[PDB]
Subunit: 678 residues, 2 copies
């Protein structure tokens, strides 16, 4: 009889109860799970029958704990984030995560050595700093997401969470092998070799397995189970092979694998995409629930017996000091981040300072130190301080982050977004009235009383002079920008443009939304039509190389394919821009009040129109075959989407049965996936 399935299933049930019963209370479910784990710990100490069930998950081996629960958490943090906004701000988030984690770790280490009375050397103190500097802010990311703007703040916090967790487990493994398995003694050159091995072979092994698995997923059609199975087995094989068979940092490998698989979303079928997002979220929730329950049980059983009043005072001063250290790190890196084109405002800086909530990664590394220490008190005090900072950060920072967003004035709903939603909900009310009027006149449902119906289906609002000429200009700017975004979504809705091209189009739209007095420019788009880079230089060198020798033309084919795919996306974004300008120029002529600013806005729009058609004419001149190819790809998308609409219409008229409709749907879906991998 397995003793682990009762604990795993009971943990799932208790996390379900904690999510259900505290979803309106401001504290998260994780602090409730830690409390329930503590109660389970004292009842395990009292009653031996509960001890026999909690023993085999309380005494989890550290290696199996890492190798099971780190890949799922790290892969869900990689998969869940938008990789496009992550790479659009990769430099700032990379320098922030890497340099901020190493300086926050070294400052927490020197604080631990100078202030804690427990005589720790620099290796154990750096282990402590690596644990305390690993952050998992899912809650701050979600709350910044639902409160409208500062979306780039949410992407920045999520990306620095992912990279911070990765390099924190890297430096944790380095100092753990320094201090707990101290048998290795080596020269300077072997240390350079080991650092090079981890720091370079991590992303390289992740890239290798990611390219292999994306090539495998691109060719698999009409079986979803193989796709989910391939992602799961690829993740666990990447981490296990990298950590054990090699000495490669497997954490960075699963980070890179997750980011690459998230980037090539087109290789996976979309129903499997929706499944994979919810599947890795479920595995995330399972891992967090189990890790928090394990932390509670072992922090009651083996860590609280060495607790002193000086230890509690050290916990309070450690919370204050680690918050101050993270804030100061953001403060010193703020000028260097201001050198980057997206500078941190002081509001976003204090949000990132407060938004660091310690999580299951730090708790798991504390559990590893605790189980590997054994009789030594260092593991117990490690576990106590990590669990205390997790509890304190969850309680204080998660209950005060919404209040701080109100205090900063970042949480206010923008007034035009309020008005558009008010018009939408009034139109929903109007449609409800129309359906009530048509539904009163039926030969059956006329007996149905409309009092309870109107009481049920009501959607309330969740929200509830040259200077004046300049304000009018800013209003016209906002109206033209929102009309352009509306046109881009309309171009998406008919299948005119690709999703990947529409992402770049709305990204240029959001860039123009960031600038106050700058309209949608032409040079920023022109840089996207520009083919210049390292790749055309290598193309010229390969054209010189025309005049492993059999493997060279495969490489020139790969380089040429990358070039023509990039300029195909350029042609698509060009077509989108001119179509959007044409639709806006049709639309906006009837609704601008002032003729002078109407002439001004049409002047800048017409100059942009002439410039984009000039650039597209030059691009079609440069290489006509890939222009013909992107026209054919647009043709295939439009025909197959209208055929999908046709089979849905024939199902709706009922003339075709549902199972043969699914057969035709799978035929057109197989054809669409064949188009997406050309």
């Amino acid at each position: 009889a397995p003793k682990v399935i009762v604990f795993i299933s009971g943990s799932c049930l208790f996390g379900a109860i904690s999510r259900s019963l505290f979803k309106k209370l401001p504290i998260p479910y994780t602090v409730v799970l830690l409390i329930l784990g503590a109660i389970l710990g004292v009842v395990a100490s009292n009653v031996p029958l509960v001890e026999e069930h909690t023993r085999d998950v309380a005494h989890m081996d550290p290696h199996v704990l890492l190798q099971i629960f780190l890949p799922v958490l790290i892969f869900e943090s990689a998969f869940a984030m938008d990789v496009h906004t992550f790479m659009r701000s990769f430099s700032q988030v990379c320098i922030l995560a890497l340099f901020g984690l190493v300086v926050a770790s070294v400052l927490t280490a020197v604080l631990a050595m100078n202030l804690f009375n427990y005589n720790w050397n620099f290796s154990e103190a750096m282990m402590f700093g690596a644990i305390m500097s690993a952050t998992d802010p899912v809650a701050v990311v979600a709350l910044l997401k639902d409160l409208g703007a500062s979306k780039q703040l949410g992407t920045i916090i999520e990306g620095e969470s992912l990279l911070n967790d990765g390099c924190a487990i890297v430096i944790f493994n380095v100092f753990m092998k320094m201090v707990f398995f101290p048998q290795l003694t080596s020269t300077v050159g072997q240390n350079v070799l080991y650092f090079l091995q981890v720091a370079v072979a991590g992303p390289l092994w992740g890239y290798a397995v990611a390219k292999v698995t994306v090539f495998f997923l691109s060719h698999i059609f009409n079986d979803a189970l193989v796709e989910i199975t391939i992602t799961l087995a690829a993740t666990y094989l990447t981490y296990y092979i990298g950590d054990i068979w090699l000495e490669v940092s497997g954490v960075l490998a699963v980070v890179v694998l997750g980011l690459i698989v998230n980037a090539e979303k087109t290789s996976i079928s979309p129903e499997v995409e929706v499944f994979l997002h919810r599947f890795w979220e479920m595995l995330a929730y399972l891992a967090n629930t189990l890790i928090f329950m394990m932390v509670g049980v072992v922090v009651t059983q083996k860590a609280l017996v060495a607790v002193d009043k000086m230890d509690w005072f050290y916990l309070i001063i450690l919370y204050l000091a680690i918050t101050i250290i993270r804030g100061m790190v953001i403060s010193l890196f703020s000028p260097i981040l201001s050198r980057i084109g997206y500078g941190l405002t002081w509001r976003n800086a204090v949000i990132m300072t407060w938004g660091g909530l310690r999580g299951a990664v730090g708790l798991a590394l504390a559990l590893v130190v605790e189980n590997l220490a054994g009789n030594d008190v260092i593991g117990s005090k490690f576990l106590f301080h990590t669990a205390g900072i997790v509890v304190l950060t969850l309680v204080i920072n998660a209950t005060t982050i919404q209040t701080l967003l109100r205090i900063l004035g970042m949480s206010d709903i923008s007034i035009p977004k309020r008005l558009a939603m008010a018009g939408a909900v009034r139109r929903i009310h109007e449609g409800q009235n129309r359906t009530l009027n048509m539904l009163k006149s039926d030969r059956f449902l006329a007996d149905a009383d409309w009092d309870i119906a109107t009481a049920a289906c009501e959607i309330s609002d969740p929200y509830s002079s040259p200077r004046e000429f300049a304000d009018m200009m800013e209003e016209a700017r906002l109206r033209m920008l929102k009309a352009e975004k509306i046109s881009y979504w309309k171009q998406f809705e008919h299948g005119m443009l690709a999703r990947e091209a529409l992402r770049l189009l709305v990204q240029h739209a959001e860039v123009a939304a960031d600038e106050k007095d700058q309209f949608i420019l032409v040079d920023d788009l022109k840089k996207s039509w520009q083919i210049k880079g390292i790749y055309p230089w290598l193309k010229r060198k390969l054209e010189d190389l025309i005049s492993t020798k059999a493997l060279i033309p495969k490489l020139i084919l790969v380089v040429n394919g990358k070039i023509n795919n990039q300029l195909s996306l350029g042609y698509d974004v060009g077509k989108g821009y001119i179509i959007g300008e044409e639709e806006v120029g049709k639309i906006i002529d009837r609704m601008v009040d002032n003729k002078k600013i109407l002439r001004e806005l049409k002047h800048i729009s017409e100059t942009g129109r002439l410039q984009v058609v000039k650039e597209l004419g030059l691009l079609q001149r440069e290489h006509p075959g890939i222009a013909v190819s992107v026209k054919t790809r647009q043709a295939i998308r439009t025909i197959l989407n209208h055929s999908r609409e046709t089979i849905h219409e024939l199902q709706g008229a009922g003339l075709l049965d549902e199972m043969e409709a699914h057969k035709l749907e799978l035929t057109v879906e197989i054809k669409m996936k064949r188009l997406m991998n050309a």
Copy 2:
């Protein structure tokens, strides 16, 4: 380091390879998994490093093998079934599964004792027959749904498979405790009490946990991970508590739990249902892959050293005998099923004899016999014979089942189905012709080569006188039934008809299509009206009872709610018939060639309409609040579906963003879930 992870992920990747490479070939992927497991077994027998990774999975404990891999297989078999068509024909699958399994087990036991040279008692031979007679034909069900008609035959075989697996593990567990753990010496009364304990408290404990789980699922809103977690934890907790903490037959508990959760699809949110179906299919696929790879490794490491040519001859004779035994069982129960309202023909009898493929359940029971036996020869012989029966049934029967379908003439395509699908594909062809014309007239794609576009967007068809007065009467019956189906599907997709109402209506369409002369009569609709049964008798007892005293109104609420659900189903099916009859009265008067035949159809249609109106009036006078309750639920459904379509219109028009449309979609889906309980 966990060595289970490399074998689990390697088996997952091998199953991915075997499915992707062997979809076109007629042999299943499972025989390729068995052969690759054998190759890995002999490699591990030579090379010690491969043994170091396969030892912890080949020498798995049998109890943990059952407690992990049986709940997922049994729950996926239960959830994958159609509960309506299973319970509509529950008597035949129940009698066939129960009596056929005990008869096949007794006959295979006496066959093992009489044939095999090694001395087995009746208990071990009964264990052998229990392993042999458990069947898992997912291939036959998939092909029979794929090959058009005999949907009812596929539901019969699926239900027989599920109940066969459940009762086979029940008889296997009681004889396993008889042989390998014969510590108990029991009285006749204790034996009667224990038989009552398994065969009664299995489904009862499953029903209790299923009602609690359904009630908890019906109240969790806005969150999906809690629902998926609740289903997974409920399954594993139900099996673990029933098998270990009680002596309850826990396989039937998982059977009843899966059948009830499959019945209450309305309690789960609609996206979670699609996720849960694919999730449990994935888990059963991983379980099948691991079970087959494990049985390959252990049959190469342990069973093949104890084989003989006499054993191979015994295996061939055993395969022929198990096929003959299944034929004799279903042939002797054929008159009893002829007394049941749906009877098996000789074609369906031979497709059910040949279609039984032995699989993962039997292989798991072979694995636990092999592990429980130890050094004795009985476990090795068990493993060899079960592996041989599985590989022979796969290789022979799963490859010959399609040509048996062709020979029996059930694989052919129906002529109205073929004509309707040809009309569907010509509608697709003319629609893509008109979109090619609209795609040729645009100044942007004006240079697009339409030849490759046309050549890539082609969807092929996958199938590819008074006597004459009687013949046109028959074809007019077919056309009228087709138009009734057309109106019923139009009522469903307009949002006015319930899904189970459409299932009953197409059941009525098939009943009227069974005999060509008879129309859709009113008597089945009367049986839908006539609520009278044990529950209205209980309602009369409640009327006696109103004249635990606080719990009594809760009981009358429960019985009244059951009656209200039955009234909702009856009102839905009758409203569907009268609306479809009105629509078909609008329709029929054009395509009928003979005026007297037209009036002949119209008279019986009008009398059916009048009868349904009279019965609806009787129901309206019978119960005051229930008719307006069902009418209000239809009103809420119509206005909420129109609100959903309005929010999709606003999102497509771009006046509402994706995040806000997600918010309002969440609001209206929460409102629909609140409508699900009233």
